Amino acid sequence: KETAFVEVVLFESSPSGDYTTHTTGLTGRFSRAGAMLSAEGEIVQMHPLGLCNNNDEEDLYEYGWVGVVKLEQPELDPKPCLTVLGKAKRAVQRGATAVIFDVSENPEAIDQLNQGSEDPLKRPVVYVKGADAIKLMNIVNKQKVARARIQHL
């Protein structure tokens, strides 16, 4: 419904103990699958297959991680362990302060995401696409660490 303003902040720990930063600007939109709230935290890319309850026990993550998930072409996975809704539910359960889906490959996820608006999650769920989604993945691919900043105007 409302536009989501994403700030990808790259940083460098100077030898003195101080930090120096470099801000990047992107734009997405809040799905009504999640809350309409601002959020911030350490970025953690998650592989789609990683978000399944099928696995009895998984790796632990430090609470407050901004999830980043690249969706695949619809016809490649016929039935997932959980739907795009359910995977966000797993992420928030596994300590995600927010979830950001790269939707370039699958637009049908938007209809599936906004389906469950009556029972929204605690935390915000956001989506991105196009040149904005490309910039995000270029930073995710090459850099070591980065802090995301989602704000709701």
Partner: protein, 103 residues
């Protein structure tokens, strides 16, 4: 060079492995990507199933490589191996031998 994957991508790496390869989620900082390998990395063990072969981590204290969920293969530096368990002091019955750090 995403090798051994039937389906690959620059953003997720390997995906849905080729033939009879083990699928493994590797992490470096924030980034995560798939990998298709035949033998699991040090600190993990290969669990074979009909349609899902994955590398689960060894959660055995003082262990660097393991056979199963609860049987270590190689202990860490300064630890003696004995019946799949890693110890500091070698139990009674037999003494240590520091050539290979075992009992």
């Amino acid at each position: 060079i995403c090798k051994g994957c039937l389906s690959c991508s620059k953003d997720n790496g390997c995906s849905r492995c080729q033939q009879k390869l083990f699928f493994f989620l590797r992490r470096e900082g924030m980034r995560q990507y798939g990998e298709c390998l035949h033998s699991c990395p040090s600190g993990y063990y290969g669990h074979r199933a009909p349609d899902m072969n994955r590398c689960a981590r060894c959660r055995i204290e003082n262990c660097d490589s393991c056979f199963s969920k609860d049987f270590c293969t190689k202990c860490k530096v300064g630890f003696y191996l004995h019946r799949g368990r890693c110890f500091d002091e070698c139990p009674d019955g037999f003494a240590p031998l520091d050539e290979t750090m075992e009992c």
